[model samples]
Target chain A: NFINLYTVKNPLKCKIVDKINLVRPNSPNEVYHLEINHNGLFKYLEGHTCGIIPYYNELRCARLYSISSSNNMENLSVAIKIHKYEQITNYGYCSGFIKNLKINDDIYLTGAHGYFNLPNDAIQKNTNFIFIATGTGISPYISFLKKLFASNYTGYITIYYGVYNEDSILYLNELEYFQKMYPNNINIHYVFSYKQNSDATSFYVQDEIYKRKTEFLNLFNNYKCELYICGHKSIRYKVMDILKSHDQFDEKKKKRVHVEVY
Target chain B: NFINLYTVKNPLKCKIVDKINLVRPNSPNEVYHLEINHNGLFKYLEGHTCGIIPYYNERCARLYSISSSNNMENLSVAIKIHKYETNYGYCSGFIKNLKINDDIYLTGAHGYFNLPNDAIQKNTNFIFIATGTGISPYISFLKKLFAYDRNSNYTGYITIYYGVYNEDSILYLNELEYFQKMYPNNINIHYVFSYKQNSDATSFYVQDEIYKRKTEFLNLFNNYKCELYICGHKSIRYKVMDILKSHDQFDEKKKKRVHVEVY
Candidate 1:
C-alpha cells in the first residue's frame, strides 16, 4: 500500500534540498550525500528504500537507493557512490545522472520500499546489534542509529565499518559525535584496507573480525544479539565463511542475521 | 580472438535441427535436448560453451554448455525451462518456443571447464558429481572419453554421483546405464534421489552418498592421480566442499585435484 502511492508510472516530484561530497578532495572515489524534500508527502521507516527515475519519461531507467535519514528528519536522504570503469573511462549511468543534479532541481522518486528493517521489539528487548557495512552500505545504519538515539533506547551497538582509507570514511564526524554522546552504548571500529603512504599492513573487516574472534563469539553466543550486514554481495559470503569456520554461525543462528546487498 | 570470431555483435546464424524432452512424461520439469547445426562454421571442444541470442538487436546472450562431443556433426545443449508461480524465465521461454529448422543466432564457443590433459592416462581415476541440468558438461566429457578405445587404453575406475528428485528427473539416463554396462569393471554409477521417500524414510543426496563412500573417496584422494569434477548449484558445491574439507581430503594444496562449476 505504501509503495503504490509513488511508483515509476506515477512518481512524486521531489526537490534536491542539498548535495555534498562526503569524501576528501584527493580521494579516488566520489561519494555524495543527497537530501531531498518531499514536504511530508509520504512516510518511511529506517530501512526503507526509494527509487530514482534518472531520465524524464523513461519508466525503465530507475535505480533504488536506501533511505539514509531517520523519520525524525523533515527531508529524505540517500548516499550515492559514483561508479567508474577502470579500463574505459565511463561513469555508471544513474550515478552520473545524480552527479550532474543541482540543488533545487526537481527529481522523480518512487516508494519507500523494502523489508530490511530492525526487529519490532528490538528497543524494548534491549537487543545487542552488530552492524557490518562497506562503502555506501552505511546509509541505513545511519538512520537506524539516529532512530535509536532519538528514542533513547538503552542497547549495545558495535559497528564495523570498512573502507579503503581514512579519507573514504563517510560521516566520520557525526559517527564520532554519536560515539562520544553514548560512550557506554556504542563502540565504533574503522577498518582500512589501505592508508596513504603508510607502511602498516592492510586489513579488511573480515581480518579484523578474525583478530577479535573472542568478542565476536561472545556476541554470536548471546540470545539477544542480532546481526545486520549490508555491503557488496561477496562480503556477506566472506563474513559467513569466517563465522562458519569458527563453528559459530549455524543454521539456528542464521535466523537472526539480516542481510542487504548490492 | 576465438570469442571474437562469433561475437554477439556479429553472431553466426544456426538452425535448430532437433529438440526433444529428456524427462519422463510424468515429470513436472521440462528439460530439452537441443541440437543446433552450425554447418561447420565453428568448432567447439567437449567443455566449451556457446551463447544464444534470443532476440534480434539484442547484444546480450545466454550461455549454455556444449553437451555433445567434438566429433558430432551438430552441437547440442541441454536447458531446463524455469517455471514459477507467476512468470516463466525470459530466455528459457524463448528457447522453449523455438521450433525445428528455426534459425538462431549464436556466439563465442569459449570456456575453460575441461578435463585435464592427464585425464587420458590409464592410471588416473575419476569422480563426477552433478545435479539437475548441471549434468550437461559431464555428458560431453563421458562421450569424448569413451570415444577412444576404452577397452584397451582406459583402465582406471570412474564413479558418477548424480542427484535428482526422482527417477523421472534423470537426464541421459539410458546413455549413463549403457556406459556402465559396457565398462562394468571400470565404471560405477550412484543415483541419489533427493525427494524419494526411501525405505528408511530419509531423503538421499549426492553429499550423503559421498560421505557414505568416504573410505573409497579417501583412497582415491590419497592416490595422487584422482581428479574430481563437480557441477551443481551453489549449495550443493558448498556442501560437497564442506564434506570433503571436514574429512581432510580437500584444501588449498589439493585444489588442483578438484574442478567445480556452480550456478
Candidate 2:
C-alpha cells in the first residue's frame, strides 16, 4: 500500500498470452497469463525497487502478484482473479490499481526491491522448505515451489495454503500432478476455511503450524532451511509469530531465516 | 543484520538516561540503548534505503545507539538499542555509532517499517511496557493471544502494550479480573540508566508529556461497573488502552470520580 509506481521505457514486449474464465457460467472474474520477451531486464531488478511505467510515463509500483508459470518453460505470466468494486477508494490497497490494467498493456516495473530474495549462497544440497499462505498470497510460493520442483533442487518442499473454497484453489490441477510426479520431493497441504465451523474445528493453517512445529524445528533447528512468507498482512503476522516463538525462531541470532511480506 | 553505521555530529551535552547488559554474562554479546541530538539532519533521510548510502558518499551519514525508549517521557529524544557485531563489515549499525544527544543523521535506512493500524489489532488497551529490546513486552504477549494480524481478521481487536514509558516510570499495583485471576505486571523496566557513554541523565515520563492524554490515566478507573464482567469482554491490549482512557465514565444515571492508576 505504501509503494509508489513510476513508468519508464517498456522493457517487456508483452503480447496477449491467454485468457481463461474462472467460473463455469460466463462471469466477469477471469485469470490471465501473459508471455513477454524481457531481454534480461529482470536481471536489473534483482535487488532494486522500481515501479511499472507504461504509456505516457504512467506508473504504479509493482504489487507482488506472482507469476503463475515460470520464467520461460511453461510461461512467464500472472494469474489475476478479477473482482469489481465501485468504491475504489476503500478497495484493497493494490487490487483497484491492478484492476486498471488492460489486455496487452505495456508495463515496465520499478524493478524488484526487497531483501526477501532466495539466498544463493550457503544453502545446503538437500533440505526442506515450508511455505504457508492464503489466497493470492499463494502466488510467490507457487513460483517458489514450481521453480524448486522443475529444476534440480534436491530438497523437500511443502506448501500449506488456506483458501475461501476448494473450487477456487489456484493451480489446483497442476499442483496435484506435481505432487505425484515429485513423490518424496514435494508435498502439498490445502485447507478451505469457508464453512461456518471453520474456527470451531477445521484444519486451518495455524493448526498445521502446531502439527509441523516439531519438523520445522528439526529442519531449521539443525540443517539448513529456507522459509518464504508472502501474502496479506494478517497471515504474515500469524506466520511471523509462530516462526519467532518456534524453537528455531531465534535462529536469526544463531542462524538466519528468509521472509518476504507482500 | 544488514544495518550500516555512520557517525554524524556529537552532542555537546547528552546524558545516559538508561542502560542494561543485554547479553548473558557468560556469552560474548551485549547491546546498549543510546540517544543523541541530531542537529536537524534527519529530514534528508527520506529518499534513501535504510541499508545503503545514496552515492558512495561515505560521509553522508552518522550513527549512534538510541539509548532510550520511545514510549518514555522524552519521546522527542530518539530511542534505539545496539548490538555490536563484526558483521556488516564492522561492529556498526545504530548501536555502536550513536550515543546520548550525539548529533547525527541516519541515512539509506529502512526495514522493520511500521504498518497501518488496521494491519495490527490496534484496539489493545492494557499495556505492559518494557524498556529497550523489550519494547514489545506487552504487545508481543497480546499478538500471541489474538494469533493473527491482517485486513480479514484484525477487524477490531485489542493489542497489549504496557510498560514503563521511560527510564523513570514505575510499574504500578496489580488487580484481578472477574474470575479473580491475578495477573502479573512486572516493573523491572528501569535497568537501562547506567550508560557510561551517556552522562547518566534521568528523564521523566508524564512530567515531559505535560498535556498528553496519558497523564489522566489515573483519573479513569473510578465508578467502573463490572456488569459486562460476567461475560468475557477481555484483558487484551487496545481494549485495555480504551478501558484505561474511558473506564467507568457511566454510573446508571450520573457520572462519578475518575479512578486513575496513580503512580
Candidate 3:
C-alpha cells in the first residue's frame, strides 16, 4: 500500500534493451520479440501484463502485452505482431510507434495488471492445467510453463496452440524441449487453422478439443484441471460451445474456465 | 473487497496532455499535476487509483489516484516525487524530469472506495482527513463537489483536516486557499503541523488539532450524519480513533462513519 501511495505521485523510468524481428524476411507477419530493462526494484507475478504508451501524435495511445518471459530477472519480454499497413503513415498509431522503437530508446510504460497467475494450490501441490491459446495469446502460457517447470510441478499439463501453419507457430523449439524433458507431464497440441485435416473443418483449437472430448471430460470433471482460454472472442465462443456439447459445462464448470480475450 | 477493487489486469493506453509542477523549485517536496487523455474511453469513480509503467518495464511501479473533477475535459492526477536521502525513487526521478507531451501508460481506474453518492442525497456531513501525499484523492472529490455545487447547492458541510511535517512540505496551499475563499461559509480547511506550530501546543499532530476543536467537531457529529475519511500514514488512525472515542460524538454503534486507506 505504501508503494502504491508513493507511486501515484512519481513516474517509473525504463529503457528498451533489445528488439528482434522474429520471423523470416518474406513472412506476412512482422513479429517482434522485444525486451526491456527495469532496475531490480520492479516485481510481477508470472501471468501479468504491461502497457506501452506509444508517443504518437498528440494522443499517447497505450496497449497491453502479456509478459512472455520468465519472472527470473529484472527484464521482461513480449512477442508483438505489428499490424501492417500498405502505407507506413496509415499504420495503427500505437503499433506503428512500437514498430519503430530501437535499442536504448525510451518508451513510456505503466505497471503490470492481471489476475492470470496460478491458483494458490498450484504452488503447494500438483495441479492439472489445460491451456487454450491462439496466435500471440500463447505468451502468458509460456510464462506459466517457465515458472511451473522451474518449480516442482509434476501434474499433467496440456497446451493447445492454434496457428495458421507451421511457419506461423511461436516458440516451437522451447515447447518441443519442454515436452521432451517432461514427457509424462507436459503435452502440446499444435492446431493449424489454415491446414486441412482429415475432416472437413480446418484444424482449430476447438476442433482439436472436440476430438479429445473423452480425455478432456475425464480430466476436467474429475482431475479438476484449470481450463484457461486466451485469444480473440471468436475462439472463446467456439471453445465454450464444444465444452457445453459434452454436458460437462455449466455454471460450476464455467467458473473453472478462465478466459482473457483481446 | 478493498484491495481487489483497486487491482486490475488490463490497461488502456493514455496520452499525456499536460503537466505542471505545482510547487516552486525551492520547495523541498516536489509535486506535479498531470493531465491524461484517453479519448474519453476510460472511466473511474472518485478515489479510485491508476498505475503507470515506466518505459519498457514489465511491472507497473507506481499507482496514483485520479485527482481531477469528474466530467472534466481531461483526466488529471497529482503525484509527489519521493526523496531517499540525496536521491529519489526511480519512478520519481523519471517523472520529475518528464517534459510536456510525453507519452505514458496507465493500468486500471479501479477501486471500490469512494464518497458515497448517497451522502449528497442524504445531506451527510463530511470530514476529509489526509496527510502529506494522501490528499490526492480528496482533490478529485472536492473538485467534483465544487462542480456539482454549481448545478445544485450541497446542503452538507465539508471540513478538511490536512497534516504535514512542516511549512515547506505543505502542498496545494494556493488551491486550497482559493477553495476556502470561494465557499467561505461551508468549506473549511485546517492545517496541522508536527514539527512546527503557530501556537504553543505541546504536540503539533493533527489529532491534537482535532481535540482543540472538539466542541465544534462534536457539534457537527451530534447534529448531522457524519462521514469521516482518513487517508495517510497508518499511525494516524490510532490517534484519530482514540480522540474520536474520547468524545461522546463518536458512536460505537455507527462505526461506518470511519473510512480509512493507510499507506
lDDT of each: 0.76, 0.39, 0.70
Model 2: per-residue lDDT, tens digit, B35-147? Answer: 33333333211111222111111122222212222223321222233233343212234334434433223432222222233333453222122222333222222333333
> CA lDDT of A94 in candidate 1?
70
| Model 3 ranges off by over 4 Å | A1-262, B1-9, B24-26, B56-61, B148-152, B196-204, B246-252
The deviation in Å at residue B15 for candidate 2 is: 59
Off by over 4 Å in 2: A1-13, A21-32, A37-40, A44-62, A72-75, A81-103, A121-124, A195-203, A244-248, A253-255, B1-263
lDDT of model 3, residue B107? 65
Which residue pairs in model 1 clash with each other?
none
| Residue A56 CA displacement from its true place in model 2, Å | 5.8
Tens-digit per-residue lDDT, B1-263, candidate 3: 32332222334666778887776554556788888987776677788777765552223437777777668767887788877656776567667766677766676765555888886577667888888767878887777666632443566788988887666566667768767787777688888767542212312378778888887666665656578888866777877788777776556665777788776
Going through the candidates in order, what fraction of the true interface contacts does each contain?
Answer: 0.00, 0.00, 0.00
Per-residue lDDT tens digits for candidate 3, residues A112-205, read 6667777767856789989988877888988888888875778999888887667667766678888899999988988876642212222367
Q: Write the per-residue lDDT of candidate 1 for residues A1-262, one digit (tens) a residue.
A: 4654676545788889999999986567798999999988857889888988663331133577888898888999998988876544756757767778899988778887887788878788788899888877788999888888875589999999887778888877778888999999999888887744211312378788888877886776764468888867757876787677857456768777888887
CAPRI tier of model 3 = incorrect
Please give the lDDT score at residue B241 for candidate 2. 38
The candidate that wins on lDDT is: 1
Give one digit per residue, the lDDT tens place, for model 1 in B1-263: 44546765457889999999999975667899999999988677777778876532212466788889877888899888886664556457667778899888788876777877766675568888888777888888888777722543667778888888788988988778778888898788888877642212212367788889988866767564578887766566667677777877455767777888766
lDDT, residue A249, model 3: 64
**Poorest stretch of ten by lDDT in candidate 3 chain A:** A1-10
Model with the higher TM-score, candidate 2 or 3: 3
